[PDB]
Structures are given as structure tokens and as C-alpha cells.
């Protein structure tokens, strides 16, 4: 009886299920999924000097995304790595033999899931949306939901996604539930699923 965060290619959904069925009420939807990230990568890769046409290279960038993109944990941190070092740079070979290099865009592209305005979408970010979806739900069932969030979908495989959500939900809680009691944060039990299959 837990909440499922299923993000595939077309759209991302947050579905709370209780002891058997999904409650159409409370369920939400974010207009930012797999494809949106792929297209966002293309934009980032053009600003870097690579000639990617949105319609002719979509499939190509998608593979770049799937092989190289990941979710940053602490963006300010991920940013410093990209600007101060070269540990993030990876070489990718395109269908024509040309070899491009990808760095900061590896985490920047997926950051859209958390910051929609980046791809000019009005919203709050799958994370903050996951918080509001349960903080509205029954006050008895909450603790259980918070500890049964399972990730589903192709676009939920980004390395470090689970850890990001957990850091986000924790951040919201500390401000929108504990008001700022650092000492009570320890009681916030958050267990995000993410199974192999």
C-alpha cells in the first residue's frame, strides 16, 4: 500500500495506492519525462559546440543521455566539479565517427525533473510534488507511504535519483513539517524503494 513514482518516456506520474487500489484523488502528473530530458540535452549540447538537429538526432542524443546522464545529488557540488575539474568529462562517438565530449550536461539535463523552469515548465519538481502528494493524504497512512515509495519507469534509472529524492523530501520535511527542528529530523523515516527489475 505504497506510492509509486513512475516516469517513462511520455510523462511522469506519482500514484498513491492504499491497501489494494489507487486513489484517483491525490494522484498527480508532471509534464516532464524521458523525452523532455532528451530534448533538453540537445539544447545543452548545442551551447557547447555540437551541431545537433532536434529531429534528425533525437535517437542519437537519447542514447547519449541513457549512457551518460545522471541525477546530481547536491547541484552546487556537481557544478563545482564540472567547472573546477574534468572528472565528469566522457567521450561519446557519434554515428559518423566524430567524437564529442560530455561533462556538466550529464547531470544538468536530468536536473529538469527537479527544476522544471529549466525547460520552461511551470511546476515544482517531481520531488516537491512527491512531498505534497503525501502531505495531503490521510495523516494515518502517511508514515507508511513515506516508507514505500517505489520508482518505476525507464526514466527513473538515473544513477543517484533515489538518493536525490530522499535528500529533497528530507529538506522539505525539515521546513514544512518540523519548522526547522534539526533534532527531530532524525525521526523522519524515509525509505525509497528502487528495485532491480
Amino acid at each position: 500500500t505504497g506510492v509509486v513514482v513512475d516516469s517513462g518516456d511520455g510523462v511522469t506520474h506519482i500514484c498513491p495506492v492504499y491497501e489494494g487500489f489507487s486513489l484517483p484523488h491525490l494522484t498527480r502528473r508532471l509534464d516532464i519525462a524521458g523525452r523532455d530530458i532528451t530534448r533538453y540535452l540537445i539544447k545543452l549540447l548545442l551551447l557547447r559546440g555540437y551541431a545537433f538537429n532536434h529531429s534528425a538526432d533525437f535517437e542519437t542524443v537519447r542514447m547519449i543521455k541513457e549512457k551518460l546522464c545522471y541525477v546530481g545529488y547536491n547541484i552546487e557540488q556537481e557544478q563545482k566539479l564540472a567547472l573546477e575539474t574534468t572528472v565528469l568529462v566522457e567521450s561519446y562517438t557519434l554515428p559518423d565517427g566524430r567524437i564529442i565530449k560530455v561533462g556538466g550536461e550529464r547531470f544538468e539535463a536530468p536536473e529538469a525533473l527537479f527544476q522544471p523552469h529549466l525547460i520552461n515548465v511551470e511546476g515544482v519538481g517531481v520531488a516537491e510534488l512527491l512531498f505534497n502528494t503525501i502531505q495531503a493524504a490521510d495523516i494515518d497512512t502517511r508514515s507508511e507511504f513515506y516508507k514505500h515509495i517505489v520508482l518505476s519507469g525507464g526514466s527513473t534509472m538515473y544513477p543517484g535519483l533515489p538518493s536525490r529524492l530522499e535528500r529533497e523530501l528530507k529538506q522539505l520535511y525539515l521546513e514544512r513539517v518540523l519548522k526547522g527542528d534539526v533534532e527531530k529530523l532524525s525521526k523522519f523515516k524515509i525509505r525509497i524503494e528502487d528495485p532491480p527489475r
Partner: protein
Amino acid sequence: AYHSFLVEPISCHAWNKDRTQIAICPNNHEVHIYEKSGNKWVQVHELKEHNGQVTGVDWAPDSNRIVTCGTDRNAYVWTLKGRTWKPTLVILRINRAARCVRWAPNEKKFAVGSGSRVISICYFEQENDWWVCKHIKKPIRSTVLSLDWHPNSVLLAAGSCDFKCRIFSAYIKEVEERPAPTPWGSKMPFGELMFESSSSCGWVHGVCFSANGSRVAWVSHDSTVCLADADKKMAVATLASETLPLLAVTFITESSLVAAGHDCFPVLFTYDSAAGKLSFGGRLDVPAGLDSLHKNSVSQISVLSGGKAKCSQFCTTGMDGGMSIWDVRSLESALKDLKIV
């Protein structure tokens, strides 16, 4: 005797019971099993299932089963069916990378250390037909780097990034039963902390139990080697090396340890039970731009034959992609001033 399987590191290795085949991880998500033909090495197998770099490999002697753990958080138990090894997924219930794994001597269970700051003890339930595990958590504060079982398949030694060498009880009652009293203690309920080193420096890169398990040794990043025997109130002997950190260690007799690491060559350490002191009678690899057989750090060492009680041959795989077989007696002939025990 040196052989280069590749130029990239060999993350870890494991040999079958007869020492006929060896399984290594060539810095991959894969495990390659090699076999000797005449005086050459022929790749006979490829185990492709992990989705991250394989960090630990162990081979149960008698059941001929292979266990592997990876950075993808998974753990697989490989069984041989005809001419192909089939993997069975084992859920460690961890959210960080698995760093090491070892079969218990009784082969009824295995332990996996991970970045989740816990040790997953796995055993199979012939009722629901699958593998389950129980966690040893307290007081592990960091990543578990290495593991080594006690001859009784219950006690377990673990080395971690919180600078501590520990021995816990991994007592599962549903596969074995009531461990006989040991010098380490009489009460061994699951997870019980039996011993913990006192040093507050250096990651414990490798740990090892002696043949009778009454002594345990470990090598830390602060270039020290240590030994503690339960027959002397768990008194610990410490030796500060003058060289680079050691990454792997094993007993070759009850009073002799052979280690290797960043210097790239194996060394010898002997223990004086009487004085409770450790000594260095090292350097077994006596004569790129180095004078050692291995060109990069040695990260694993295993007893090939003769057990840990009277080892005649041992193996070393390293970050140079090399595997080296050493003959304990040949080393004693070449170095007439060498001890052992």
C-alpha cells in the same frame, strides 16, 4: 611466476577447489574464468549479469558455486549447469555499492560488506526457494572493505573505513547450530560484537583469521600490520612499516603472515607468541620501471595450496592486471636468510 591477463586492474579473483580455474574481474561488470592448457591460459567462461564493477568474488570449494557482488548493489550466486554458469539474484537490501564477499567455510552462507556501512549475511531457504539475508549493522560507522570467516563458519572478521578491525558472530540457527565456545568468547548470538581493534587511524584494507581462528590479522592504510590472538586476552601486536600501505594479507602458518599492497611486492611477517611481538622478515619478490613482478599495487592475496596452516603456494592479483603464483619453498631456497613461523 607472473602472468598478465590484461593491463587494466584485476579487481578481485577466486580459484575453484582443485585450483584448476581462476575467476577474475578485469575492471568490468564481468567475471572471466580462466583455465590452464599445458602452460598457457585459455578463457573458458564469461559471467555477464552485474550492471556495475564486480568488487568481490568467492568460490565455494565443494558445492562449486561462485558468488559475486558489485557496485550495482547486487550479489549473484552462480551455479554450473552443463557448460554454462547461470546466475541467481540475491537481494542484499543495501542502497550503496557492495564491496566484498566471502563464503563461510561450511558453504551454507556468505557475507557481503558494502558502502551502506553494514554486512549482509546470506543463506538459502529451501522452503520459499530463495536467498535471504540478515544485517550486522552496529557499530559499523563506514564502508566495509574486507571480510574473512573463522574456521567455525560463525565468527566473522571485518575491516572498515572507520579504521576498525572487528569480529562479529554471524550465527544463523536455521542452517547451522550453536557454535562451540571459542577463546573469542562463549556467547555468540547473531550480530554480537566479539572484538574491536583500538586504533583510530587507517582504513583496514584486509583482514584474516589464522588456520585455527584463534588469531586475526589486518593491514591498515597507515602502513601498519596487526595481529590479535584470543589466547592472550585478545592482546594486539602492531608493526609500523617503513613503506607504503598493504592492501591484502593472509596467514601461511599459525605464526606467519604474507602481505602485499602499494609497494607492489609481497612481504613476510612473523609473530612471536612468547613476546607477543610482530616482526618483519619481508620482501619475497627480489630482483615500466620497477624491480617487482607486479607493476601496480597488489590488492588481493590468497592461499593456493597447503591451507593457512602450512601454505606451499599463494596467489596475488593486482592493479596491473597481473596474477602471480608464489612457491613458499622456492622463496626459501632463493633467500637463505628467510624464516617463516
